[PDB]
Amino acid sequence: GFVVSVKVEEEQLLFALTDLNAEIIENTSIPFSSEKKPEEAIELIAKNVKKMCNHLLGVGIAISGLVNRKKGTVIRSTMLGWENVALEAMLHAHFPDIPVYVDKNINCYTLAELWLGEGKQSNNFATVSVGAGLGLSVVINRQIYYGAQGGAGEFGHTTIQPGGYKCHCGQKGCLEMYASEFYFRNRGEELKEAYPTSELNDFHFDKVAKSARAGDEMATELMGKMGEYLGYGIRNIINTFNPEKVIIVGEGLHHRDLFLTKIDEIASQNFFSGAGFETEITTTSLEDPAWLQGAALLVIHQLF
Amino acid sequence: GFVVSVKVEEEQLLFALTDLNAEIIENTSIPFSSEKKPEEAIELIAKNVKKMCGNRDMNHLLGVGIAISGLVNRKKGTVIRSTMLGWENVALEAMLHAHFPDIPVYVDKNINCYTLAELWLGEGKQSNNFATVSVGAGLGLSVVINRQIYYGAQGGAGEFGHTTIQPGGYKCHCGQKGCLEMYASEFYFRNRGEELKEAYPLNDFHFDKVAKSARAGDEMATELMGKMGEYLGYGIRNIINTFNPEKVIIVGEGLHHRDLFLTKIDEIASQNFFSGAGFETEITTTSLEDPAWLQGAALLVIHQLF
Ligand SMILES: OC[C@H]1O[C@H](OC[C@H]2O[C@H](O)[C@H](O)[C@@H](O)[C@@H]2O)[C@H](O)[C@@H](O)[C@@H]1O
Numbered sequence: 001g002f003v004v005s006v007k008v009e010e011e012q013l014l015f016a017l018t019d020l021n022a023e024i025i026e027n028t029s030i031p032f033s034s035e036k037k038p039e040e041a042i043e044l045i046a047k048n049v050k051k052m053c054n055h056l057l058g059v060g061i062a063i064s065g066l067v068n069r070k071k072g073t074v075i076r077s078t079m080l081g082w083e084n085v086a087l088e089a090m091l092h093a094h095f096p097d098i099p100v101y102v103d104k105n106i107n108c109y110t111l112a113e114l115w116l117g118e119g120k121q122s123n124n125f126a127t128v129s130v131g132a133g134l135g136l137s138v139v140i141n142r143q144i145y146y147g148a149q150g151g152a153g154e155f156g157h158t159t160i161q162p163g164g165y166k167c168h169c170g171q172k173g174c175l176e177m178y179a180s181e182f183y184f185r186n187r188g189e190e191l192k193e194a195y196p197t198s199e200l201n202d203f204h205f206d207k208v209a210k211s212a213r214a215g216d217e218m219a220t221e222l223m224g225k226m227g228e229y230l231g232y233g234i235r236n237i238i239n240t241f242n243p244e245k246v247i248i249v250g251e252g253l254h255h256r257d258l259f260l261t262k263i264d265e266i267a268s269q270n271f272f273s274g275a276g277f278e279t280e281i282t283t284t285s286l287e288d289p290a291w292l293q294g295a296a297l298l299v300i301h302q303l304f
Numbered sequence: 305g306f307v308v309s310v311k312v313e314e315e316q317l318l319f320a321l322t323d324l325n326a327e328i329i330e331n332t333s334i335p336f337s338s339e340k341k342p343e344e345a346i347e348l349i350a351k352n353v354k355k356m357c358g359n360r361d362m363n364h365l366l367g368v369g370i371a372i373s374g375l376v377n378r379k380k381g382t383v384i385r386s387t388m389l390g391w392e393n394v395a396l397e398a399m400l401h402a403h404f405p406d407i408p409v410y411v412d413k414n415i416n417c418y419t420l421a422e423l424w425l426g427e428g429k430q431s432n433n434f435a436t437v438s439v440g441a442g443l444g445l446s447v448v449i450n451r452q453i454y455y456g457a458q459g460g461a462g463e464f465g466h467t468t469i470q471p472g473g474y475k476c477h478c479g480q481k482g483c484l485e486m487y488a489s490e491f492y493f494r495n496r497g498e499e500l501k502e503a504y505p506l507n508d509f510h511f512d513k514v515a516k517s518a519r520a521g522d523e524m525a526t527e528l529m530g531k532m533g534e535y536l537g538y539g540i541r542n543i544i545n546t547f548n549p550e551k552v553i554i555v556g557e558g559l560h561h562r563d564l565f566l567t568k569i570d571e572i573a574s575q576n577f578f579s580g581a582g583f584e585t586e587i588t589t590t591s592l593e594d595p596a597w598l599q600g601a602a603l604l605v606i607h608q609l610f
Pocket residue numbers: 008009010063064065066078079104105106129130131132133134135136154156157176250251252
């Protein structure tokens with residue numbers, strides 16, 4: 001009795017085999033750029049699901065973008081450049097009598113928080129992810145809020161700087177262009193000429209954090225500003241939702257020492273704290289594999 | 305039976321007498337700036353509640369509903385924080401009960417009251433997840449999820465006017481810098497208008513006055529009004545990407561001058577995460593009018609009594 005879950009990131013596919021309590025039995029990571037390559041990615045997924053396995057009760061998939069959870073399709077992921085991808089149908093060519101379920105990445109994480117994490121107690125909280133992009137999932141009554149057609153929570157594509165950086169979504173000035181890994185490239189390209197002896201020219205989160213800790217001037221400017229914008233974003237979430245608490249999650253937390261304080265400084269100055277009512281902003285006690293545990297719970301709740 | 309409703313604005317107090325369908329029977333408005341004067345406001349409210357009742361059996365007054373800006377504790381009827389008014393911990397319901405100790409008094413945020421009117425009387429009656437956004441003196445939001453207003457943890461949800469649209473921008477009455485309200489409401493006209501004086505050699509920055517000058521062809525007022533509409537567009541875009549509402553209902557006194565900014569909203573807000581995939585979100589103006597703030601505050605009472 002087992003479930004297989006998948007997280008489709010932009011530069012790697014993650015897999016796990018879990019039991020019926022979403023406890024991980026095995027997990028792996030396959031380097032692959034899925035950008036504009038859904039068919040090839042899905043063949044790799046099928047191959048790697050088969051590799052991990054009769055008593056496969058389902059496959060759960062966490063992915064970026066607008067998903068139709070009813071049909072198992074990826075309507076629009078501008079993170080991946082995927083347009084109307086029939087993910088469930090395509091995997092069912094390989095695994096005919098195995099349920100496939102798809103949901104937005106951060107919604108899957110939030111299922112994990114609800115069942116295993118600091119969303120055990122709470123009934124109204126928000127989950128914000130930091131890393132490659134910026135994600136949001138809001139829980140209202142221990143239920144994820146999906147909005148009219150499952151698209152709620154594209155908080156990364158709220159405008160934080162009108163007229164600012166061009167986003168992958170087609171808009172200018174999206175929060176994700178300032179309050180995620182994308183900022184390091186957007187701003188780092190502009191700063192090259194001013195900082196010609198910077199170590200830094202790979203703008204992945206890890207590399208930027210490494211250089212910032214090493215005292216590189218450009219890297220610390222990038223990391224400092226990204227934290228400020230993330231602070232604005234979390235403040236916005238607070239003033240908008242009045243959540244009981246905000247739970248920060250995501251791979252960016254490997255470098256939390258470089259931005260959490262900045263987030264707290266900004267986000268704790270909010271509409272309700274002006275009256276003396278503080279909103280708790282806390283980091284998840286779950287780790288990176290909870291994206292996969294959550295995608296598994298996607299299947300498990302469909303069963304029971 | 306009847307109820308009396310009140311809307312506490314920043315420069316006037318509005319009143320209505322209402323039957324139990326929220327139909328307005330009487331109304332009045334007193335020009336009074338309640339800015340840092342809660343005690344005087346309550347005396348005026350008490351006076352005008354009585355005036356609304358007229359010669360009626362006061363025994364038939366079923367309750368009083370009050371629409372107001374800011375963070376309200378809707379259980380105790382306190383105004384915890386209205387930075388629009390400069391009020392903090394005003395025990396509005398208790399102060400009123402001192403005058404009317406034997407009738408219910410209910411308090412809620414202004415745009416929540418309007419949204420009750422949309423739910424019962426308007427374009428919200430036929431929807432289950434929609435967002436209501438008010439334009440005028442400030443920028444309000446109420447979101448309905450399953451035909452219920454979403455209040456969040458302590459009733460504070462929807463301070464969307466105090467999301468940051470321009471980091472480092474205009475100082476807001478809430479204490480933050482760069483709030484959406486400083487760009488997508490009447491406040492923008494003062495904020496930006498003061499900066500544009502030297503560029504355009506209009507001195508009253510109220511919404512009505514700026515609208516008048518913009519229609520008359522005043523370059524400054526036209527520039528103010530266009531940009532305000534752009535910012536309101538971004539605000540509504542953000543609402544859409546955040547909530548994926550079935551629809552957005554625009555409401556408020558700012559709509560008296562809708563022809564000066566509504567097309568700018570649609571241009572910006574229609575470009576959103578879901579419309580990129582061919583799914584349009586309807587953005588429409590309410591068919592209700594200004595008195596629905598008062599009808600909503602009456603519904604606040606009625607639908608808590610019955
Ligand atoms: O925050 C870490 C997280 O970033 C992405 O997911 C968040 C977010 O990214 C874009 O805004 C999409 O439009 C949203 O639908 C996504 O929720 C990465 O995809 C994810 O792998 C990473 O953990």
